Amino acid sequence: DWNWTIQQNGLSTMQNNLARVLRPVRAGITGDFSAESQFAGNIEIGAPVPLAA
Amino acid sequence: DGYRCGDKTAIKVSNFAYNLDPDSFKHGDVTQSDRQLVKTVVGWAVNDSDTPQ
């Protein structure tokens, strides 16, 4: 019952504090990534040899 | 003479392979030596419009 909390602590009281709680956190994440047995591979098309028709 | 008469050592030629040098390769005539029908299909399609499909 949020109305109960209002009559007990004051609307503006919590109104302000909730923003202090919920505001966005802007940050830059540094660091890296690692993973176990994943797949890997490669594909290649080699140079043409001038000989057919 | 010597220790053990005969019982000679031997040099054996096993498998072998070819570095098929891409600079040359003549494919000759191709044929079959027999027949046996597996399965066929016959049909057709038509274009009842004024545009290529």
UniProtKB/Swiss-Prot annotation, chain A:
Proteolytic cleavage and subsequent release of the propeptide trigger a major conformation change, leading to the formation of a heptameric pre-pore that then inserts into the host membrane. It is found in: Secreted; Host cell membrane. The C-terminal propeptide is required for normal protein folding and secretion; it maintains the aerolysin precursor in its soluble form and prevents premature heptamerization and pore formation. Secreted, cytolytic toxin that forms pores in host membranes after proteolytic removal of a C-terminal propeptide, leading to destruction of the membrane permeability barrier and host cell death. The pores are formed by transmembrane beta-strands and are approximately 3 nm in diameter. Belongs to the aerolysin family. Homodimer in solution; homoheptamer in the host membrane. After binding to GPI-anchored proteins in target membranes and proteolytic removal of the C-terminal propeptide, the protein assembles into a heptameric pre-pore complex. A further conformation change leads to insertion into the host membrane. This is Aerolysin. It comes from Aeromonas hydrophila. The lineage of its organism: Bacteria, Pseudomonadati, Pseudomonadota, Gammaproteobacteria, Aeromonadales. The gene is aerA. The chain holds residues 395 to 447 of 493 of the full protein.
UniProtKB/Swiss-Prot annotation, chain B:
Coiled coil: none annotated. Proteolytic cleavage and subsequent release of the propeptide trigger a major conformation change, leading to the formation of a heptameric pre-pore that then inserts into the host membrane. It is found in: Secreted; Host cell membrane. The C-terminal propeptide is required for normal protein folding and secretion; it maintains the aerolysin precursor in its soluble form and prevents premature heptamerization and pore formation. Secreted, cytolytic toxin that forms pores in host membranes after proteolytic removal of a C-terminal propeptide, leading to destruction of the membrane permeability barrier and host cell death. The pores are formed by transmembrane beta-strands and are approximately 3 nm in diameter. Homodimer in solution; homoheptamer in the host membrane. After binding to GPI-anchored proteins in target membranes and proteolytic removal of the C-terminal propeptide, the protein assembles into a heptameric pre-pore complex. A further conformation change leads to insertion into the host membrane. Belongs to the aerolysin family. This is Aerolysin. It comes from Aeromonas hydrophila.
